Amino acid sequence: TGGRNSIRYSELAPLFDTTRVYLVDNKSTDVASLNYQNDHSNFLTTVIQNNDYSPGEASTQTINLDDRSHWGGDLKTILHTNMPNVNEFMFTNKFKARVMVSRSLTKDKQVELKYEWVEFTLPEGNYSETMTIDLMNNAIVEHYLKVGRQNGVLESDIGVKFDTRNFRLGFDPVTGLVMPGVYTNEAFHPDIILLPGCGVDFTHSRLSNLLGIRKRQPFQEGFRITYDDLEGGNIPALLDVDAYQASLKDPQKKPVIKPLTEDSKKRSYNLISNDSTFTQYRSWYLAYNYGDPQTGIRSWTLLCTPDVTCGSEQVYWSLPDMMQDPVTFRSTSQISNFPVVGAELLPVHSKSFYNDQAVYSQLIRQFTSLTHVFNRFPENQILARPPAPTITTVSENVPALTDHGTLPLRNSIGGVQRVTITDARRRTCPYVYKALGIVSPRVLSSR
Amino acid sequence: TGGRNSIRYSELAPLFDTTRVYLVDNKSTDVASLNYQNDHSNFLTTVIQNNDYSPGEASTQTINLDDRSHWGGDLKTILHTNMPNVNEFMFTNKFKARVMVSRSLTKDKQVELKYEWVEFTLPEGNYSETMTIDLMNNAIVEHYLKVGRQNGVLESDIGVKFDTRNFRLGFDPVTGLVMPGVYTNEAFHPDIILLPGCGVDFTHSRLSNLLGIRKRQPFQEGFRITYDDLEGGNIPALLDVDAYQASLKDPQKKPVIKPLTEDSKKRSYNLISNDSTFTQYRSWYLAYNYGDPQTGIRSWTLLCTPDVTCGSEQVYWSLPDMMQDPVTFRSTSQISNFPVVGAELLPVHSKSFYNDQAVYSQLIRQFTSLTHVFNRFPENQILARPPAPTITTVSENVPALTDHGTLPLRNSIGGVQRVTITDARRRTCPYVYKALGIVSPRVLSSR
Amino acid sequence: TGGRNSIRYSELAPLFDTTRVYLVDNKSTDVASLNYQNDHSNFLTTVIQNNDYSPGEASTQTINLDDRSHWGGDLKTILHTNMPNVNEFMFTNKFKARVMVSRSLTKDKQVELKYEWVEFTLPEGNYSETMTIDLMNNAIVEHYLKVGRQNGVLESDIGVKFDTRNFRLGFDPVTGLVMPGVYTNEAFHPDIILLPGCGVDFTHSRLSNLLGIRKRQPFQEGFRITYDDLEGGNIPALLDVDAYQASLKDPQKKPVIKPLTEDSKKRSYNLISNDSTFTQYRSWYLAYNYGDPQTGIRSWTLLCTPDVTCGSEQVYWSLPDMMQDPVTFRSTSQISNFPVVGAELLPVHSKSFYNDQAVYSQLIRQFTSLTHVFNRFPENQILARPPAPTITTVSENVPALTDHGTLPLRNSIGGVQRVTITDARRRTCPYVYKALGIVSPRVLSSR
Amino acid sequence: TGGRNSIRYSELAPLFDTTRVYLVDNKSTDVASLNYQNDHSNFLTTVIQNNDYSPGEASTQTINLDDRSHWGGDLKTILHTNMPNVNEFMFTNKFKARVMVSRSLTKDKQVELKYEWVEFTLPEGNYSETMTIDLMNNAIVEHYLKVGRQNGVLESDIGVKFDTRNFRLGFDPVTGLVMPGVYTNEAFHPDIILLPGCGVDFTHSRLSNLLGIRKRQPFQEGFRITYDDLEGGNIPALLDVDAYQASLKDPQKKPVIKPLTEDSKKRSYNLISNDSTFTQYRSWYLAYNYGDPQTGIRSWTLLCTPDVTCGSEQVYWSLPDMMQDPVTFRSTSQISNFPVVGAELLPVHSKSFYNDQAVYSQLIRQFTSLTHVFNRFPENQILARPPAPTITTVSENVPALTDHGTLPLRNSIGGVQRVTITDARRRTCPYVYKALGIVSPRVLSSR
């Protein structure tokens, strides 16, 4: 300490031992003159808080930590964002799926079914755990319109659906059917329901996480899940309620065996055989939980909690112009490679709420009335509308009063410092409303 | 340490090493005599806690940290506010918008439409994420009354509305219409719906943030968003439900093509052509998400989360009379420029709650009864009342037991210290109920 | 300090005193090349953050903390999971129970009842405190189908049920009956209802904890709770409401004495004697609270709060390649035995919510309509459906910004470090989405 | 430091400066062999984490902090319980009350009323702030059955009731009656309603706290509150609604004066005189708030918030075999007197929720139907069922990642350490699911 303290500035007098320099964006004189073209995730600040000098002029002056000692500073910071649930940036507004796009009676008498992969995109916005799903199913439909139907494709065969129920609760071990004649609409984890000849890929989307279907060994570029994969676990068919009820008057067999085939407005349930009790529709959930664990999807995939945020990602601070470049970091000027002084999780959590609207809706569509762009197939038990789970989650932004350690810094702090927040991939982050830094230099050793 | 400790006061005896001085407002003797004309964000305190002296008299005595050493103190503080959501101070009670103000059949046979920018103000208060919106729409209407109508202006042409739905979900790729004949009233982010010849400016309001429409490169003074800007993304028209239904009895074309034109009480939906399926009404949301991303508003603007607080802003502490002035700060007496010793976020967070009242209201206006100053156009599908989003947020004030570092201080602490909290712009902050400071001096080095 | 600081790297220059090395998974170059076959709970990272070298090549270079001093580093870490409530791993998807599996009129005229232990498994997923229970009861039934019934077993005798009410509130001290003729369906802690000749074992399941029935002295391998154990505390029988009401017209005794025997669709309530007011059904809750405290189950067991998480378990960090092996730990290469540097609770908490759906359901099954795979015996007052408790809990995953102490480390940190999170049993943990480590070395003493 | 660091173990090599020893229960080898008969609140752990030695054998070896220095360690700990709201241990399942137990027409023509104190106990479980109350009222009734009634006691005179409303809101200053003819059933703090000749004592129960009736000077063993105490503040009588309404047809006085006397099924409201407007029933709340503050109960008692937990109690850690015994503590082997190294609040908080079920119930008993063991006197306005308060609280268990200071420890840490958590009264605590300790020794001074 002794002669090694002195923290000096132009003529303003000697200050001794730790003090405080401030890194702030909202500083009025600065904005107008320096970071006009920049944004909160990468700006310039005048660290000289002296009322009498131009910002430019200040950019000349310097804070001089005494030369005789290696100094260090404590970096506390206040980060506050407002990034939405889904958006193009975090890759939560896109997802490739393969659907039916054409159905025509080929040239002889046999038929043709051609499928294709299409990328559907969501309208940017902050959503629910559910409404997001819905938005996806809708985006599937919206396509069936611009193309599908108008090419021999019947809703009775739309290839992909994201629902949320255990399509085999009512199932009866012997009858081979969902006895109650209705797939019990309770919510049990996001799922994926496919059809023959199609599937979905998330290779470039974090939405996967929203669903909660994670790859059992992630570091494998690529995420395709198709029909052939979902093996063992095709949605069993609903038993014919009426045929059964209507019977019992007059070897003497009963109406049981009759597995419903279609529903009001005659929508095909595409059953494998005119025999088998299983429909062609295949569910991930079903597969994972019910089909061979050592071979099924239960093998290469993992069932887990949703998380609307789509994945806690972190950000990296960098104060290139004011702090020594940590161990192996190379010093540069390429914004997308500055040295990093602190890492921290991007300020987003998921609040959970109890859903009353769970059942309230089961007592309104039972009393017929209009429909949403979401339940375009009310009377279908499958292309219906996935049941709203009790307890929805919602991505919520929150101020993060974080605190990075104490770092080594240069002894000639420039009048104008540059602040820069970066993300995992290394790029500014548009969704930053406020960055604030406080540094407290203090002597560490001697030269 | 050795001889350098001694913390002395008048005759009261030697105290050794760190101790504690207290900065408090609620001290009874003080109020009456010193900070009568002041407020919690800028007051005087007698730091001498000795029962026997006048406050004035005390203002003479002094706490003497030993001279032989440079001292420092730990500053912990308790800040507690109660600022409301919207108010004149934080600029959340004003916002300029351009509306229709006159409609008369000009002199020949052509017509005249004159528009003007008017500033509408809200009644101060703490609101919801939604009710705030509503308050704004109302403030638009309230003006249409004092002026608009009584000058040939028909509600059928009120220029600005802040709603919250995706005005194009039911849309059908081929019919060019919102098939279900009703814009599906689900909430998906605050939006702005304009008309020809008008728009809104937030150049001087944080309400922008409440809506969640942020400028893609903020440091640009000025925020005007007009009709011409919202290009591509005019609300499509609702299909005529009846015309279509009523048909199908008797080349042989159907009632489809007929896009509704007006609604019960015949309110014009102002459609571009007697042809086109698009109404003149333009939505921001629509633009951002559906119209050309490289040219549309999606370009210069950014879609993001609401935040009722309107923007986490920070405050600055200053204890001019008791702590050495940090690095570059100049020493002065101009309250609005004192040195700063600590920065901290203004004590306001946003709590979120689940909205049951989301639908409950869809089952009460379907069963006709009175109206609120909010739904003055129930039968309009557009000037209706934006759907209440599930999950509302509410600005909430909370005590902040913060802790600034350890700062260097003078060795002659005056009997009367001055505390001062300031905001980003540098001015006291009326909404401060309690400020409390605790300082713990302790030796740092030697002189 | 003096000459002992120097933190050196290849030619990049001398860095002095503490700095920062980063342990991160999401690093792009790494994934592709090193931890392809690994997962977030056990991966490799290149700690050399220098843009110009291959990952392989980097794996050569080294960070050299000065040789002359023993160094130490501060290890802060960010752990984030997403493990579900029930699953095969945490042993929350299995549980052995003993049920009736056969009922036939033995060879002479006496009868035969054979029982057996069967393991039932749940569909993996994240559940409620209740719906979990339900899932279990269902899993009991689902078995009764594949076997039970089709072998002379009548629902009127299914052996195990997990309910949640105090089966003896209405009870009248003299009549020896539940007067109101209905077991008051309010929820009061998970319970277990058995029948003669059967029981349940949790010897290999944490579900026990979900129920909240803990063994009074845990370190005893084995958890079997059978009929004979639940002594004193057999569910009293419901009084015959009608017999009583229908009477009172004409020594002159009343219809009281008549304890109902069966319910609509005549389901036997299996009463011990045609006399006794007690049914053969026995409840844990009842036992614990009402039967002899010094002998009953109240003795060897303990009644306590549920907790959906099934048990706060912890995890162990290990950074074998970068930090000295703590006191007694042996140095090795067997992943399942690495040295441990930090322990921390596995990131899972239980959020609680208020249940409105508590009663809403009592006003819908009173108005007859379909049934769930859950209430297959609506008209039974016992095999009914346990009442939903107000205030349900739900396992929720949360990011854990933890902080382990400051640890001693090697002075030759390898270009490639290995991170490894382990659980109590010592094995990687599939449910880890993100692990992040920040180390801040700093001199501790001298060599 | 210099030669004073060395932390040694058998042959495993020299470790220098702070390191980490771990105190864990869930360690597999340990359980089976050492703490078989123990529980989580008092167990043994092998601190030697070396894979190759028996636990017994390990119990021999020792960690040797260097001899030349006095060492200290940082003790961080993870405590997690699951204790329920009410239970026998925390004394929340018992409470003495004095009730009517006999009513017979004495030998001459005068009568006899004998009262007695009885202890009622609750069924153990975790409850609500309310349902607990209810459980108590029920427990009062349940007794009236086994004894009361069957001895001339009419419900019309059951002595104690725990309700929750201000029995005198409708009251009219002149008529001396609760005009609306109904005690306005809104909830305003737990209360106690007594009758002549009886009362309640909490001398041995924390339930008092649940009610929120605390003794104004606690350190006084004993808590009896009887009739004679509740002076001034007898529940006023409800005005006869009908008598009044039915009148007004024909000095000419009105039906006012008539204070109802009994209710449907003629239950006596026991009014002092055939005159006075006051019933014999006395309320604590009433007393405290309305009767003489300098003499009434308002004097020796204190009205305050409920708190379901019944009282934040703390626990004491003790690591007898590994840390020096703090200042005045005597060293011993009596588990219930070990030295204490850290104190901490027993991990229980009270979550609050908003009650919709507040009114929902006022619109179901107004539409007659069955009754609960709770509202056995629906038509009574007094023995009714206390109104459910909006905002109920619920005891909730939570993991407590606490941190005790840095303590002095022995330099010869035994292979097997003993952990022990104790409560205020000094006894193990059955409700402990997990205890975890991490110690970080580090040199403090020299010998």
From chain A residues 107-146, the ones with a CB under 8 A of any chain C CB are: none
Q: Is the minimum CB–CB distance between C299 and chain A shorter than 8 Å?
A: no
Residue D8 neighbours by CB distance under 10 Å: 17
Chain C residues within 8 A of A304 when measuring between CB atoms? 82-84, 126, 431
Tokens of D287: 């007393």
CA angle D375, D376, D377 (to 5 degrees): 90
Q: Is A2 in the B-facing interface, judged by CB distances under 8 Å? A: yes
Give residue B381's identity as a one-letter amino acid code. Q
Cα radius of gyration rounded to whole Å, chain A: 31
Nearest CA in chain C to D83: C304
- Report yes or no: A222 at the C interface, CB cutoff 8 Å: no
The tally of CA atoms less than 13 A away on the side-chain side of residue C240 is: 16
CA-based nearest distance C283→chain A, Å: 27
- Chain D: nearest CA to C13, how far in angstroms? 28
Closest residue by Cα to residue B385 from B135, B111, B88: B135
Q: How far is CA C247 from CA C242, C253, C254, C258, in A?
A: 8, 10, 7, 11
3-class SS shares of chain D: helix, strand, coil, % to 5: 15, 35, 50
Domain boundaries A1-82+314-345+399-447, CATH class: mainly beta
Contact between chains at D87 and C303 (C-beta distance less than 8 A): yes
Q: Which residue has the tokens 């009282």?
A: D311
Q: According to DSSP H, which parts of A232-348 are helical?
A: 241-246, 284-290, 297-300
Alpha carbon of A373: minimum distance to chain C alpha carbons (Å): 27
For B59, half-sphere exposure in the C-beta direction (CA atoms, 13 angstrom radius) is 14
Nearest-Cα residue of chain B relative to residue A401: B345
Q: Does domain C83-313+346-398 have CATH number 3.90.1620.10?
A: yes
Task: Give the torsion through C-alpha atoms of C159, C165, C166, C168, to 10 deg.
Answer: -70
Binary contact (C328, D9; C-beta < 8 A)? yes
Amino acid at B148: G
- Non-local (6+) Cβ contacts of D426 within 8 A are D316, D336, D337
Helices (H), B59-152: 129-143
Give the Cα separation of D383 and A145 in Å (integer).
65
Tokens of A331: 């010093």
Task: State the Cα–Cα distance between residues A102 and A98, nearest whole angstrom.
Answer: 12
- Please check whether residue C57 touches A, CB under 8 A: no
What residues have CB less than 8 Å from A116, skipping those under 6 apart?
A98, A99, A101
User: Which member of C184, C289, C305 has the closest CB to residue D397?
Assistant: C305
What is the rounded distance in angstroms from the CA atom of residue B139 to the CA atom of residue C150? 72
Q: Is B222 left (phi over 0), alpha (psi -120 to 50) or beta?
A: left
| Surface-to-core class of residue D147, CB atoms within 10 Å of its CB (0-12 exposed, 13-18 middle, 19+ buried) | middle
Question: Which residue out of B302, B328, B390 would a mutagenesis test of the A interface target, given it has the greatest number of A Cβ atoms within 10 Å?
Answer: B328
Q: Could you give the 3-state DSSP secondary structure of residue D131?
A: helix
Q: Does A2 sit within 8 Å of B345, measured CB to CB?
A: no
Write out the H or E segment, with its range, that includes residue D420: strand D416-420
Asked whether the beta carbons of residue D32 and residue C221 sit closer than 8 angstroms, the reply is yes
Chains touching chain B at 3 or more Cβ pairs under 8 angstroms?
A: A
Contacts of residues D188-191 at CB distance under 8 Å and 24 or more positions apart, as own/partner, are D188/D164, D188/D285, D189/D164, D189/D285, D189/D303, D189/D306, D190/D133, D190/D162, D190/D164, D190/D306, D191/D162, D191/D163, D191/D164, D191/D165, D191/D283, D191/D284, D191/D285, D191/D286
Q: CB A38 to CB B72 under 8 A?
A: no
Contact A51 B303 (CB under 8 A): no
Residues of C in contact with A290 (CB under 8 A): 123
Structure tokens at C398: 């949360």
| Neighbouring-strand partners of residue A429 | none
| DSSP string covering D169-224 | SSEETTTTEETTSS----B-S---EE-TT-EEE-TT-THHHHHTEEESS-SSS--E
Q: Which two tokens stand for residue C274?
A: 């045609």
Could C221 and D126 be called an inter-chain contact, meaning their C-beta atoms sit closer than 8 Å?
no
Residue numbers in B near A1 (CB within 8 A): 445-446
Task: Establish if B367 touches chain A: CB-CB under 8 angstroms.
Answer: no
Q: Do residues B94 and B423 make contact, with C-beta atoms less than 8 angstroms apart?
A: no
Q: Which CA distances in Å does B317 have to A52, B98, D64, D162, D191? A: 21, 40, 50, 52, 47
Indicate the burial class of D208 (C-beta count within 10 angstroms; 0-12, 13-18, 19 or more).
Answer: buried
A partners (3+ CB pairs within 8 A) are B, C
- Residue D303 has which token pair? 């009205």
CA distance A109 to chain B (A): 30
- Residue range(s) in chain B whose domain bears CATH number 3.90.1620.10: 83-313+346-398
Backbone region of residue C186 per phi and psi (left: phi > 0; alpha: psi in -120 to 50; beta: other values): beta
User: Residue B18: exposed, middle, or buried by beta-carbon count in 10 A (0-12, 13-18, 19+)?
Assistant: middle
Whether chain B has a CB inside 8 Å of the CB on A105: the answer is: no
Tokens of D230: 């509740």
D244-263 burial, b at 16+ Cβ within 10 Å, e below that, comes to beeeeeeeeeeebebbbbeb
Paired tokens of B276: 């086109």
Interface test with A, best of B4, B172, B219 (most A CBs within 10 A): B219
d(CA A416, CA A59): 5
Find how far residue C37's CA is from the centre of its chain: 30
Q: Which residues pair with D99 in a beta bridge?
A: D116
Contact (Cβ atoms closer than 8 angstroms) between residue C163 and residue C191: yes
Beta bridge partners of C267: C263
Q: Name the token pair of D155.
A: 């419900």
Q: Does C188 touch chain D (CB under 8 A)?
A: yes
By Cβ distance, the residue of A17, A48, A49 closest to B70 is A17
Contact of B314 with B346, CB cutoff 8 Å: yes
Whether residue B313 lies within 8 A of chain A, CB to CB, comes out as yes
CB-hemisphere CA count at 13 Å for C70? 19
* CATH 2.60.120.550 intervals, chain C: 1-82+314-345+399-447
Residue C41 contacts residue A352 (beta carbons within 8 Å): no
Distance, C-alpha D391 to centroid of its chain = 18
Return d(Cα A78, Cα A401) in angstroms, integer. 5
Written as one letter, the residue type at A230 is L
Of the candidates C447, B328, C400, C8, the one whose C-alpha atom is nearest the C-alpha of residue A59 is: B328
Q: Are C390 and D431 inside 8 Å of each other by CB?
A: no
Distance to chain C for D192, nearest Cα, Å: 23
CB spacing of A396 vs B341 below 8 angstroms: no
Å between B330 CA and nearest CA of chain A:
6
Which alpha helices (DSSP H) does A68-144 contain, by range?
A: 129-143
A186 touches chain C (CB under 8 A): yes
Chain B neighbors of A438, CB-CB under 8 A: 343, 405
Tell me how many residue pairs between chain A and chain B have CB atoms under 8 A apart.
Answer: 184
Residues C302 and D83: beta-carbon distance below 8 Å: no
Q: Measured between beta carbons, which residues in chain C are less than 8 angstroms from residue D48?
A: 328
Q: What is the DSSP string of C267-316?
A: EE--BSSSS-SEEEEEEHHHHHHHS-TTTSHHHHEEE----TTSS--EEE
Q: What is the distance between the alpha carbons of residues B80 and B102, in angstroms, rounded to a whole number?
A: 48
Residue with the two structure tokens 């023509």:
D109
By the 10 Å C-beta count (0-12 exposed, 13-18 middle, 19+ buried), C134 is classed as buried
D129/D296 Cα distance (integer angstroms):
27
- Chain B residue numbers with beta carbons less than 8 Å from the beta carbon of A373 are 169-170, 180, 184
Q: Does A241 touch chain C (CB under 8 A)?
A: no
